[PDB]
Amino acid sequence: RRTYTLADYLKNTFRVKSYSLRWVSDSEYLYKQENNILLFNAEHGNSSIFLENSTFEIFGDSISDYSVSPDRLFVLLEYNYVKQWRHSYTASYSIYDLNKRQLITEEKIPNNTQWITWSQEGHKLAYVWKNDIYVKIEPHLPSHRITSTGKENVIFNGINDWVYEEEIFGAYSALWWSPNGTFLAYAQFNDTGVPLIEYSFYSDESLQYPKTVWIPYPKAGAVNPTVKFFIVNTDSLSSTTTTIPMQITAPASVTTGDHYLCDVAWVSEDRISLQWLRRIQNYSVMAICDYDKTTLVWNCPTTQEHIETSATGWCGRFRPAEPHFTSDGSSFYKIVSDKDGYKHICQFQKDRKPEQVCTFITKGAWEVISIEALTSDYLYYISNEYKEMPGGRNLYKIQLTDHTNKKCLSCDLNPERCQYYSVSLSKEAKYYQLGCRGPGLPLYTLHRSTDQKELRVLEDNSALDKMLQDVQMPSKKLDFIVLNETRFWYQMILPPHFDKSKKYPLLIDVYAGPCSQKADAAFRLNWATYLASTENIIVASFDGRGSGYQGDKIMHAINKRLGTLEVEDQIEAARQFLKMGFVDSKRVAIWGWSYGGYVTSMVLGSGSGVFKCGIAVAPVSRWEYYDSVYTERYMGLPTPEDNLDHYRNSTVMSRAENFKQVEYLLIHGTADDNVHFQQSAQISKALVDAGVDFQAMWYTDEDHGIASSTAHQHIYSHMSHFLQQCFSLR
Amino acid sequence: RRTYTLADYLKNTFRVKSYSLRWVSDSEYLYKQENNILLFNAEHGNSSIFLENSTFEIFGDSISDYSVSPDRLFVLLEYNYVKQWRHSYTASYSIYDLNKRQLITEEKIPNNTQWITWSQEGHKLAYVWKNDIYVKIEPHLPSHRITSTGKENVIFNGINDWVYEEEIFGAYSALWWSPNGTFLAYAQFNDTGVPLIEYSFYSDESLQYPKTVWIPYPKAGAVNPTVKFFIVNTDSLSSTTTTIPMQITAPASVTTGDHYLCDVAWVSEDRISLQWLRRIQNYSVMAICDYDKTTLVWNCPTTQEHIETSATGWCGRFRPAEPHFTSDGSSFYKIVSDKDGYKHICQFQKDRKPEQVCTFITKGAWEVISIEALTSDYLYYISNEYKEMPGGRNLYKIQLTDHTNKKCLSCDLNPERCQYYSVSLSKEAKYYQLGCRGPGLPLYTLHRSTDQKELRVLEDNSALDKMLQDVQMPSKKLDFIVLNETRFWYQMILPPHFDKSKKYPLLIDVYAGPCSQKADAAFRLNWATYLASTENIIVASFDGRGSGYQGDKIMHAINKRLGTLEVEDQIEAARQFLKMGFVDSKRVAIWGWSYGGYVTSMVLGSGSGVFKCGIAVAPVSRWEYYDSVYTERYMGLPTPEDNLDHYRNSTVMSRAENFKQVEYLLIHGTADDNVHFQQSAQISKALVDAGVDFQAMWYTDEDHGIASSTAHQHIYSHMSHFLQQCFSLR
Numbered sequence A, B: 001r002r003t004y005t006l007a008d009y010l011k012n013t014f015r016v017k018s019y020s021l022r023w024v025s026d027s028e029y030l031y032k033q034e035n036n037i038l039l040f041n042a043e044h045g046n047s048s049i050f051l052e053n054s055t056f057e058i059f060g061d062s063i064s065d066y067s068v069s070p071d072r073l074f075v076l077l078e079y080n081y082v083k084q085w086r087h088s089y090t091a092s093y094s095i096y097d098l099n100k101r102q103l104i105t106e107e108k109i110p111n112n113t114q115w116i117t118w119s120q121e122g123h124k125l126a127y128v129w130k131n132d133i134y135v136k137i138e139p140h141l142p143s144h145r146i147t148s149t150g151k152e153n154v155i156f157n158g159i160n161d162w163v164y165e166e167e168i169f170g171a172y173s174a175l176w177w178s179p180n181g182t183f184l185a186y187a188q189f190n191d192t193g194v195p196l197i198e199y200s201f202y203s204d205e206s207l208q209y210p211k212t213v214w215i216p217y218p219k220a221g222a223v224n225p226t227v228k229f230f231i232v233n234t235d236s237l238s239s240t241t242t243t244i245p246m247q248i249t250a251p252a253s254v255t256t257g258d259h260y261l262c263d264v265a266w267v268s269e270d271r272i273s274l275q276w277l278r279r280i281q282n283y284s285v286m287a288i289c290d291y292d293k294t295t296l297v298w299n300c301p302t303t304q305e306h307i308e309t310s311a312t313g314w315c316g317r318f319r320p321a322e323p324h325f326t327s328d329g330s331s332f333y334k335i336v337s338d339k340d341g342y343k344h345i346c347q348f349q350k351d352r353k354p355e356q357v358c359t360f361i362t363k364g365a366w367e368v369i370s371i372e373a374l375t376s377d378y379l380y381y382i383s384n385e386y387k388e389m390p391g392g393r394n395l396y397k398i399q400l401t402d403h404t405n406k407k408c409l410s411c412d413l414n415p416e417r418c419q420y421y422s423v424s425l426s427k428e429a430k431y432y433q434l435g436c437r438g439p440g441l442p443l444y445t446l447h448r449s450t451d452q453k454e455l456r457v458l459e460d461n462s463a464l465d466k467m468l469q470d471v472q473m474p475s476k477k478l479d480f481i482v483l484n485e486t487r488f489w490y491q492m493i494l495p496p497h498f499d500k501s502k503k504y505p506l507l508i509d510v511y512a513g514p515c516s517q518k519a520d521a522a523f524r525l526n527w528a529t530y531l532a533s534t535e536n537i538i539v540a541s542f543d544g545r546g547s548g549y550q551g552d553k554i555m556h557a558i559n560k561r562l563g564t565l566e567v568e569d570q571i572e573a574a575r576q577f578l579k580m581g582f583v584d585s586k587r588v589a590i591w592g593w594s595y596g597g598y599v600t601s602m603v604l605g606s607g608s609g610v611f612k613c614g615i616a617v618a619p620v621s622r623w624e625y626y627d628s629v630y631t632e633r634y635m636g637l638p639t640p641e642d643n644l645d646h647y648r649n650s651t652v653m654s655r656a657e658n659f660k661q662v663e664y665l666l667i668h669g670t671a672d673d674n675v676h677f678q679q680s681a682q683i684s685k686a687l688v689d690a691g692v693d694f695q696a697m698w699y700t701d702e703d704h705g706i707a708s709s710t711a712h713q714h715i716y717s718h719m720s721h722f723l724q725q726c727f728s729l730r
């Protein structure tokens, strides 16, 4: 009769296993086991040792990761990992010669590399160090410097600057090997006019004077960084001291004013696809560029230029979706909103066509989440079509020659346990691993593509299952409410022996940022689990307007006016939950992180009287404080000539007064480089001037995630106690 | 039956009046009344209008202050006041010609002056602007630039840099007019090698990117600023484009290494007294310098050099005491510790004498607080001799020709109501205003010096008295405990109908810094008043070792080891209070500000089990973080060759563990330039790593005093609630 305690969560007592493999070919893959990389044969569980328990310990215990060259002849050993922002980080590397059976020690790789990657085929390497790009045709050979304009916080070659990393690519890398490794493409960013933001860093208590971290960060409407695109010929490095990269210039319909590099996609060795986006993101252009053998230049003729537009809001979910070309690169499939505002797969031709560039291959009031693989005959994708559950994920496949031969491949498998799938096809789709994140304990199984026959179960959390037997776990309900004639899904984490006749305290879990989705069919062992299992609290999330994957009507409802409908709908949802009966109207709370903290705050300050208390963690308090790429995408520019009025109307501090009717807890990280401390500092000041008491908590030297081990435990314990006080429990 | 509420304190409902006059001559003074400066005649209440209700409003309502030229012919009108640190600040000024009856508008004074002052006699002015000094022989005439080396955060001419202001002079000024205004002396500070500290400033929520304030601040052991002393001849400015200031160089026994300019005191027009102090403050030298008419130079012969030393700790209370010379400047009286370690008045001769430079004029186990006036026949001073109450203040006077004719002048007056006096003698001591801050409501009366006849009562808070009639006020007990054969005074704010048989919660109010005194006979209407009157809580302060004015044995006990005895003694005191009976051992708290927050923290982290909770406001957490002048004075240098061990042994973070047994509230200002936020940031981090829950609160853009109106109210309300939670009241 034991429950899921706060300790179970914080000390991660119940481990949830998975099966993360690495397809090496169309029929074999790599899997880490007891710190041994093993090569498996899809078809027959037949295994084999690829890399020994050894090797990895030569570098003590700092071996952060590993990367096997595509030709399996070498392995990159990553160690001395040091984080920087969400995806950035520097590390040390060592190449291990599998064949020669030892660590390559000659032409080593710099001891502070910012990024590195194998070519798509051989054993070529491209890495960024000191903001410059370097190439090594062979692990044994000396590196060739590709650029020399690199300069900290100014010129970035092959890596993204702060905003591009966080808001555009969602990765640190800005390198792209062409197939067959002839060319190496890369972006160059110039942060010259971008303003700086700074935060103090206290470090060890032995540091007498705290440091100061400076970061070029463009807030709404500020001067943004600039971009340039290059492609350098790799096959010539051996015969020159320097190679002259050829530049590709963004298309004219984008050059007039501020703009961004959206996405990079190599079609073939002589064709590359680049997507561009204007600062006001309701206009995007995909240019297909071809390599001229004769004049040794790349051309991006307007004839092969494709335009994506939006009159409702912005292009794509967070940016235009990536194209998927056919072998011969004559056509490509890409996810775009159809006439009804639903993100679906449609076909394009290399050359654009006058107002008929697309032919949809998918229709319906549901959306394609992502294209997973494109074969010569089949197109594998993932959607939330099944059972009309937008919060569900299933793998499908369409025959190219016959768009009717559409078949769901995960629907039947385990309709009870599995409704949220992840996939991973082999190099040419002969097999496919399925990742059931579904309602029940996650289940991983690999199948043979031909007939979908499950070859075997890779991982079924039977061990986790056995442990959860002696524990009173809570249940998760995923349903929907209907407002103004529209379905709006929500989810509830119900405490163990949930009795619909009793009354329970309610905690709204929020985010509700544009195109977000808190209500889904995924299994989780988080804080809400403890809150339900041991405190008997109902944790509910609601995907309202501006949310998820249910068409642009719902997602673009927030356009140019954040801090509006998404906030109201979060209140309406609470109202409805009360009408459901099992909720103690006298004990309703709400908490959120980042965007969530913003809404949490906007809600608490609405004076709706519906909530007793709330917790905002690292909240955005006013949009002019947040970065440009993100903010502007939904808010436009904060100028009187555009949307200044809405920027100033959606402030948290402007609602300071209504906080007198609430127990508020504001938490923020001292080193938050994403949502700067300023945001909360501005909130606290507003409340203090209004004479409103509240509780605060700062976390010295913590990131936007406050995820360091001790801080992570500390913040959740603190919030737990805040709720216990608020709900009259402890 | 109403009590003193939190609101009464925060909204300052019960005003406590005073009578701050400005002696203009030996028989007249100035007094502000209904915004009118009135000239009074001491002797006959006979008054008269000096400055109209008018004049002051010409500058709207920003008239911050006023200064009347010594010859009463002009008045400085200060407006547009903008604070900077404790005593620094810039303002605008206008000279008003009393005679011509109008504002001088010709040679105006810069609109951002850092400091300004009339000469000692005429109507000469000296002001600092942009770190340079300027002189104006006449309000109508153009200013003469005296220096031109001034540079922000680097060269300071006539004003102190951050540390000199805060820790040495306790004022912004570094200018000294000689009597008769011939010369103008000034200090010049160079902050070149002094490290910088920085804090962010968020300002209005409209500021998109927060500012960064940089301040040259030397922490313990860092490179300190350097000094130079100059005296410029003012009588020549009319006949040159530039004058060449003559420099005085500190004495040899100080020049070898780091040192400071202690104090400046003009003896006569051709003699000036300068005090110097070595970085390790147990050595000080007072040089008397004479002006050579022939070679136009100042000489400070070693023969007129006086040495002050200390083997117990440091020189003076916070620095060597100021000398008081006789008319002919042949001798001077100064407060120094006698053979027994008691600060007393002793006589010196211009020329030093081999180990007999002093002749004490005062003996006893009590100390002279300060010399108030030196006449040709009498020496007026203030001591805590009466009733052997170190926490008491009384005015005395000794006849120079007969050291036996010693008489207390305030002792009898109102033994019941008055025990803490302040004084203010007229120019040549013909009259003297007394300021009874004593136990009862403050009483101000002026007397005729000759026979001490009280001419009249200037202010008796009869109005405040009438209002306090309908209010249940608490009482203040000032007694002493005795530990290891020594008296140690304490004070208690007892709630209204205090019943010695019941049990009350106890709140220890702390500071306990070196030479501090929290237990005295002064009347106050603060937070403790509300805590006793309305929450029935006993607020007690205890002056333990290292404290107040009770001889060096007690004060120097802390030497080279802060965070020791003063902390223990604070616990011992609580033990004793419990033994007294009327204290609920289950509800004992402790709170402090600055140094007080440090001890509060050190106490809570001692694991003595004696305290339930506590509140530390802007606490110092480890001495290496605090400034040099202050820290080193008591701790020496943080080097292994000196006191590094004690620096590292007295850390708050090193006691993080023992905080698991306490409810702790940490509060700090975001813009604290004194005790940097770092100190608390380091504390919170230490506790988070120890897994200790606690409460924090930051105050956006607040100073070390968190004294802005809204913040001031907010912080006290917050602490009030913290205590109510801790003491199970609200």
Ligand SMILES: *[C@@H]1O[C@H](CO)[C@@H](O)[C@H](O)[C@H]1NC(C)=O
Pocket (backbone or CB within 6 Å): A034, A035, A036, A053
């Ligand atoms: C691999 O190492 C683990 C511990 O790191 C050890 O238990 C195991 O026996 C080793 N080899 C195999 C095949 O598991």
Ligand SMILES: *[C@@H]1O[C@H](CO)[C@@H](O)[C@H](O)[C@H]1NC(C)=O
Pocket (backbone or CB within 6 Å): A280, A282, A283, A309, A310, A311, A636, A642
């Ligand atoms: C894009 O947004 C702007 C307003 O921000 C609007 O004027 C323009 O017409 C919009 N439409 C497109 C297709 O860019």
Ligand SMILES: *[C@@H]1O[C@H](CO)[C@@H](O)[C@H](O)[C@H]1NC(C)=O
Pocket (backbone or CB within 6 Å): A483, A484, A545, A565, A568, A569, A572
């Ligand atoms: C439904 O209509 C009402 C109009 O009163 C509006 O407030 C609300 O936002 C609309 N939609 C939803 C989902 O509530």
Ligand SMILES: *[C@@H]1O[C@H](CO)[C@@H](O)[C@H](O)[C@H]1NC(C)=O
Pocket (backbone or CB within 6 Å): B039, B040, B041, B046, B047, B048
């Ligand atoms: C009264 O005081 C004024 C100045 O305040 C002085 O001039 C005068 O002589 C005094 N006596 C009389 C009777 O005016």
Ligand SMILES: *[C@@H]1O[C@H](CO)[C@@H](O)[C@H](O)[C@H]1NC(C)=O
Pocket (backbone or CB within 6 Å): B280, B282, B283, B309, B310, B311, B636
């Ligand atoms: C001053 O302090 C130092 C060490 O802190 C000591 O060695 C010296 O003797 C002390 N006394 C004097 C008069 O300098």
Ligand SMILES: *[C@@H]1O[C@H](CO)[C@@H](O)[C@H](O)[C@H]1NC(C)=O
Pocket (backbone or CB within 6 Å): B483, B484, B568, B569, B572
């Ligand atoms: C008295 O002596 C004891 C040690 O014998 C010590 O603990 C205490 O601090 C001393 N002084 C005082 C004021 O308690």
Ligand SMILES: *[C@H]1O[C@H](CO)[C@@H](O)[C@H](O)[C@H]1NC(C)=O
Pocket (backbone or CB within 6 Å): A039, A040, A041, A044, A046, A047, A048
């Ligand atoms: C199965 O795979 C292994 C390597 O994973 C391969 O060497 C072997 O030839 C395959 N089958 C058999 C029967 O050996």
Ligand SMILES: *[C@H]1O[C@H](CO)[C@@H](O)[C@H](O)[C@H]1NC(C)=O
Pocket (backbone or CB within 6 Å): A149, A155, A188, A190, A192, A193, A226
């Ligand atoms: C990027 O812009 C900055 C400022 O406009 C300029 O100094 C820099 O040279 C530009 N481009 C490159 C490749 O450096």
Ligand SMILES: *[C@H]1O[C@H](CO)[C@@H](O)[C@H](O)[C@H]1NC(C)=O
Pocket (backbone or CB within 6 Å): B034, B035, B036, B053
């Ligand atoms: C002058 O005006 C004030 C208001 O500032 C008023 O209270 C007063 O009656 C006037 N002066 C005198 C001496 O009463």
Ligand SMILES: *[C@H]1O[C@H](CO)[C@@H](O)[C@H](O)[C@H]1NC(C)=O
Pocket (backbone or CB within 6 Å): B149, B155, B190, B192, B193, B226
């Ligand atoms: C003060 O010290 C700094 C640093 O050594 C030096 O550059 C400066 O010239 C010195 N004096 C003056 C008057 O500037």
